[PDB]
Amino acid sequence: SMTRFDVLTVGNAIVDIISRCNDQFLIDNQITKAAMNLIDAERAELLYSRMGPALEASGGSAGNTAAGVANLGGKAAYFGNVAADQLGDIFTHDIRAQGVHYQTKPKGAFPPTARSMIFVTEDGERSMNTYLGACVELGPEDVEADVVADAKVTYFEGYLWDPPRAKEAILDCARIAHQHGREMSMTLSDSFCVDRYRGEFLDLMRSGKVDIVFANRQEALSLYQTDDFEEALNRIAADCKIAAVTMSENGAVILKGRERYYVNAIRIREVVDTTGAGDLFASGFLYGYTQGRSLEDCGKLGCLAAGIVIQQIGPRPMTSLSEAAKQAGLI
Amino acid sequence: MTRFDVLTVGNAIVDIISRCNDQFLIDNQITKAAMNLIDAERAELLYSRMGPALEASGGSAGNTAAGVANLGGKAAYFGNVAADQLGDIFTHDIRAQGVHYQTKPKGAFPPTARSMIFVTEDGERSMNTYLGACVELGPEDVEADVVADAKVTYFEGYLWDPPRAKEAILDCARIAHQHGREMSMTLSDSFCVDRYRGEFLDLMRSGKVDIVFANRQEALSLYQTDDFEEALNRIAADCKIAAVTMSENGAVILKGRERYYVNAIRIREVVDTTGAGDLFASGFLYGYTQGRSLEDCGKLGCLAAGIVIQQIGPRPMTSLSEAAKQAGLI
Ligand SMILES: Nc1ncnc2c1ncn2[C@@H]1O[C@H](CO)[C@@H](O)[C@H]1O
Ligand SMILES: Nc1ncnc2c1ncn2[C@@H]1O[C@H](CO)[C@@H](O)[C@H]1O
Ligand SMILES: COc1ccc(C2(C(=O)O)CC2)cc1
Ligand SMILES: COc1ccc(C2(C(=O)O)CC2)cc1
Ligand SMILES: NC1=Nc2cccc3cccc(c23)N1
Ligand SMILES: NC1=Nc2cccc3cccc(c23)N1
Ligand SMILES: NC1=Nc2cccc3cccc(c23)N1
Ligand SMILES: NC1=Nc2cccc3cccc(c23)N1
Ligand SMILES: NC1=Nc2cccc3cccc(c23)N1
Ligand SMILES: NC1=Nc2cccc3cccc(c23)N1
Ligand SMILES: NC1=Nc2cccc3cccc(c23)N1
Ligand SMILES: NC1=Nc2cccc3cccc(c23)N1
Ligand SMILES: [K+]
Ligand SMILES: [K+]
Structure with a gap:
């Protein structure tokens, strides 16, 4: 059993x-x-x-x-x-x-x-509006190999394709993670980012470097350059082992092969600031996944965390997600 | 015309x-x-x-x-x-x-x-405050033209902690009063008053400060009393105008024998009280430099203070002028 990390x-x-x-x-x-x-x-x-x-x-x-x-x-x-x-x-x-x-x-x-x-x-x-600054220095030297080896899932941003050398670190992570029987995951990050790196992102998925892919609706449509969301869902399911596709107020769909699991968005009192929604969806999903939960329950946990974060200013919840999960009976 | 309402x-x-x-x-x-x-x-x-x-x-x-x-x-x-x-x-x-x-x-x-x-x-x-660069504030930082051109110059009792800031404040009071302006201070914090009680009373009694802001605890601390009525009577004798805040109990404005009580506004929830007294002073001084009655100055103060405690962070992220208009205060 014991691993040092659930998610890097x-x-x-x-x-x-x-x-x-x-x-x-x-x-x-x-x-x-x-x-x-x-x-x-x-x-x-x-x-x-x-x-x-x-x-x-x-x-x-x-x-x-x-x-x-x-x-x-x-x-x-x-x-x-x-x-x-x-x-x-x-x-x-x-x-x-x-x-x-x-x-x-x-x-x-x-x-x-x-x-x-x-x-x-x-x-x-x-x-x-992002000035990358010191992010341009991230490279293979920053891969703590023992950490990647000891993490159930290593998850990274499509956004890392903008700085010059971060992708080299990510390839090293995929090698180490897979050698140690772990899984790799990515988020498509942003529809324009997908426009910039479409071919490379598809390659990461199709070559098996990435096992679990996160996307929102716009990112999925951008990935396949389509306006047909059904086409986008069918194609993303063919390109990666597990895909989690978020749809804002319309909830999320989790795909695995031919399996599909739809999850409802939670009740929102007010949309204060949507910053962090997709990031916290991934938190809740990956928490559930690395706890051995069903894909539906991982989706439910993602929707819960995302719904909480959009009701505050700032991208990291200031309240206890574990308490909210317990109250919601997701635990 | 004056360049500034409040410095x-x-x-x-x-x-x-x-x-x-x-x-x-x-x-x-x-x-x-x-x-x-x-x-x-x-x-x-x-x-x-x-x-x-x-x-x-x-x-x-x-x-x-x-x-x-x-x-x-x-x-x-x-x-x-x-x-x-x-x-x-x-x-x-x-x-x-x-x-x-x-x-x-x-x-x-x-x-x-x-x-x-x-x-x-x-x-x-x-x-929990690390003063850092604040210790450098001194007379060299007084922009004399700005003080000369401000209807009211308002300062913190907190300035008595760093070493040289008080020298800047004395220069301000001299310049302000030479130009027929008014000086104002806040007592800032009850422990700050414990540290500088004598000096604060001197600022008031010598006329260096015209308008004083205090909360209930600060007023009690200034006179080392448990009797709030005593504190109100004494503060009124020590300065031209005193504005004393009382949190959910609103505020009282004193001038000579005049007293004006103002209610706190209704609030949804106390999120974070940081800034309440600072924003009471904003509303009060805004009204004061617009020629408003002391009661209306208190009303503007209570509005601003009540707004700021319903958000995280010390400076309102919403329009206070819009809120004042809606409240029929402007
Ligand atoms: N180029 C970027 N790479 C990674 N994260 C970013 C980028 N630009 C903005 N963000 C982050 O996206 C978050 C919201 O998903 C914000 O907290 C912000 O810091
Ligand atoms: N020593 C100090 N002097 C002046 N302001 C302070 C001090 N310590 C904290 N504050 C400020 O008090 C404000 C709330 O009244 C906060 O925004 C905080 O920055
Ligand atoms: C408000 O956001 C920023 C402001 C300024 C910067 C620069 C800096 O040197 O810090 C110019 C590059 C970077 C970001
Ligand atoms: C979190 O607040 C602080 C943290 C650190 C500091 C010091 C600094 O050099 O910046 C040590 C003095 C000052 C304040
Ligand atoms: N914003 C800003 N960034 C700077 C970076 C480096 C040197 C400077 C010199 C003057 C003003 C600056 C900078 N203003
Ligand atoms: N002179 C100057 N140098 C800077 C260096 C780095 C950042 C800055 C930001 C604002 C203003 C600056 C600087 N002004
Ligand atoms: N980088 C940078 N250099 C500056 C040099 C001199 C004056 C400035 C003023 C504003 C921003 C600056 C500078 N930003
Ligand atoms: N601000 C600051 N942070 C640091 C973090 C880690 C190492 C440092 C070394 C020199 C100066 C620093 C740092 N200055
Ligand atoms: N927090 C912190 N502040 C510092 C300020 C100045 C010098 C340092 C040197 C080492 C570690 C530090 C500091 N750690
Ligand atoms: N402020 C500060 N100065 C330091 C000087 C030298 C060594 C340090 C080590 C830790 C934290 C420090 C220092 N913090
Ligand atoms: N080495 C080191 N130098 C610092 C200088 C100034 C501020 C700091 C803050 C944190 C850690 C630091 C520093 N570590
Ligand atoms: N960060 C930064 N801010 C500045 C503000 C004003 C003057 C400066 C001069 C040198 C370096 C600076 C500054 N570095
Ligand atoms: K948010
Ligand atoms: K506040």
């Missing part, structure tokens, strides 16, 4: 800078709504100068997913690179404080720690 | 905010509901024990200036950060609110001040 996640280590804005702000600043918009240093300074008073919170898609696993009671670890600066110190504090193993060492102060300026519109949608 | 002066701080259970405060010997000063070693120790947190620009007077600007008043701020990432955040957030903020960092060490604020289930907040 790997991603871009980012601190979020969060502000509300009106619809017009996105138009005026040519920010693509609901997407991850990469920005350079000059653009980061420009947009920040236009941004209202903000709140900061540790983010990073995989970072949030690890934190959610820990919160639910699972044993989690994280690889991601910050700088030796104050923002890096915040990031390091927050993930470790959640009880996630995080030991990736900063390489210097420059490039500085990544930030994402996240603008939340009145509908609760979030539009992200 | 505020205080310790420039970034808040690090987390929820905790009651036992956490006991285990760590944190005085509940108070501002606990800490050194660098203690800051590192407490942070190592603190859960996942959120960061938000803070500082009592910083928050008050931001609230004035949010309501539609014109505000300025003096307070010192370091030339570091946290200082950049502080500078961004206050300027982004439309507050004039031009105090220059002096170096990277000491680093920008932080306050670890632990919020218990009752919504109470217990603050």
Whole structure:
């Protein structure tokens, strides 16, 4: 039995800078709504100068997913690179404080720690503007091989295909994980990210480097360049062992071969801020999966965690997911 | 015309905010509901024990200036950060609110001040503050033209902890009064009053301070009494105008023998009391510099304070001017 970790996640280590804005702000600043918009240093300074008073919170898609696993009671670890600066110190504090193993060492102060300026519109949608900074230094040297060897599932972001060398680390992870009889998982991350790396993502799935794939509706449609969601579901099921496809207020569908399991979204009092929804869906799913739960129950746990996170500001739940799971009889 | 309605002066701080259970405060010997000063070693120790947190620009007077600007008043701020990432955040957030903020960092060490604020289930907040770069604030940071051009200059009693900030405040009072402006202070915290009781009374009695803000505990501490009626009578004799807050019991505004009682607004839930007194001062000073009655100044103060305690973080994320309009106050 005993493994050190249930879930290792790997991603871009980012601190979020969060502000509300009106619809017009996105138009005026040519920010693509609901997407991850990469920005350079000059653009980061420009947009920040236009941004209202903000709140900061540790983010990073995989970072949030690890934190959610820990919160639910699972044993989690994280690889991601910050700088030796104050923002890096915040990031390091927050993930470790959640009880996630995080030991990736900063390489210097420059490039500085990544930030994402996240603008939340009145509908609760979030539009992200990300300066990768120190994330560009993540590489094979940051793979703690003993950790990957000792984790039931290693999960990574499609977003890692933007920085130059992160993919090399991910291939090393797949090798180690599979040599030790573990599973690999990825999230498609963002529809434009899928547009950038479609062929490579399909290759990861078809070659068996990735066993479990997370997607939302838009990402699945983007993967196959279709407007037919039924086609997207059929094709994703043929390309990976297990696929979990989220559909916002329409819940989720879990696919395995010919098996399909539909899960309802939970009741939401209000959509405060959708930042982190997919990340926490993956937390709940991977927690259930590494606890030996049915695929339906993994879906239920994902929907519970995702529904909780969209009802607060900030991407990591500030309430106990394990308590919520117990109350919900998912346990 | 005047360039500024309200200049505020205080310790420039970034808040690090987390929820905790009651036992956490006991285990760590944190005085509940108070501002606990800490050194660098203690800051590192407490942070190592603190859960996942959120960061938000803070500082009592910083928050008050931001609230004035949010309501539609014109505000300025003096307070010192370091030339570091946290200082950049502080500078961004206050300027982004439309507050004039031009105090220059002096170096990277000491680093920008932080306050670890632990919020218990009752919504109470217990603050643990490393002053850092705030110790550098001095007379060199007084923009004399700004003080000369501000209807009211308001400062924190908290400024009596760093070594040289009081010298800046004395220069401010001289400049403000030479130009026919008014000076105001908040007593800040009951333990801060215990430290500087005599000096605070002197500021009031010598006329350096015209308008004083206090909560119930601070007023009791100022006169070392358990009798709130005594405290109200004495504070009214010591300053021209006193605004005394009483949490869910609202506020009372005193001027000479005049008293004006104002009700607290109705709230959905006490989420986090951080900033309540700072935002009461925002609403009061906004109304005051708009020529409003003292009762209406109190009403604006209670509105702003009630709004801020229903959110996480010390500066309202919603429009105070819109709320005031809806409440029929503007
Ligand atoms: N390029 C990126 N790579 C990984 N995570 C990101 C990226 N841009 C934004 N995020 C994170 O996505 C999270 C929401 O899913 C936010 O907490 C934010 O930090
Ligand atoms: N010593 C201090 N001086 C001034 N403001 C402080 C101090 N300690 C905490 N604060 C601020 O008090 C605010 C709440 O009134 C918080 O936003 C916090 O930054
Ligand atoms: C508000 O977000 C950002 C602001 C600034 C940055 C830079 C930095 O040097 O810190 C310019 C690259 C990066 C991100
Ligand atoms: C969490 O709050 C703090 C953590 C650390 C600090 C020090 C710093 O050098 O930044 C040690 C003084 C100061 C505040
Ligand atoms: N935002 C910002 N980033 C900087 C990075 C490096 C050097 C600088 C010099 C002046 C102002 C800056 C920077 N402003
Ligand atoms: N990187 C960089 N950013 C700047 C932003 C604003 C002003 C500057 C002045 C000099 C050098 C700079 C900056 N260098
Ligand atoms: N802020 C910060 N400064 C550092 C300087 C030198 C080494 C470090 C190592 C880890 C984290 C750091 C530093 N964080
Ligand atoms: N070595 C080193 N470690 C740090 C850890 C956390 C914060 C820091 C701030 C300044 C310098 C540091 C650190 N130098
Ligand atoms: N503030 C601070 N200064 C240090 C100097 C030298 C060594 C340290 C080791 C841990 C934490 C430190 C220090 N924290
Ligand atoms: N937290 C922390 N702060 C530091 C400030 C300055 C120097 C340091 C050196 C080592 C470790 C540190 C620090 N750890
Ligand atoms: N982060 C940061 N670095 C600085 C380096 C040198 C001068 C500064 C002046 C203002 C703000 C700064 C800096 N903020
Ligand atoms: N001079 C200077 N100004 C800055 C302003 C804001 C952010 C910075 C980051 C690094 C270096 C800086 C700055 N150097
Ligand atoms: K959220
Ligand atoms: K608050």
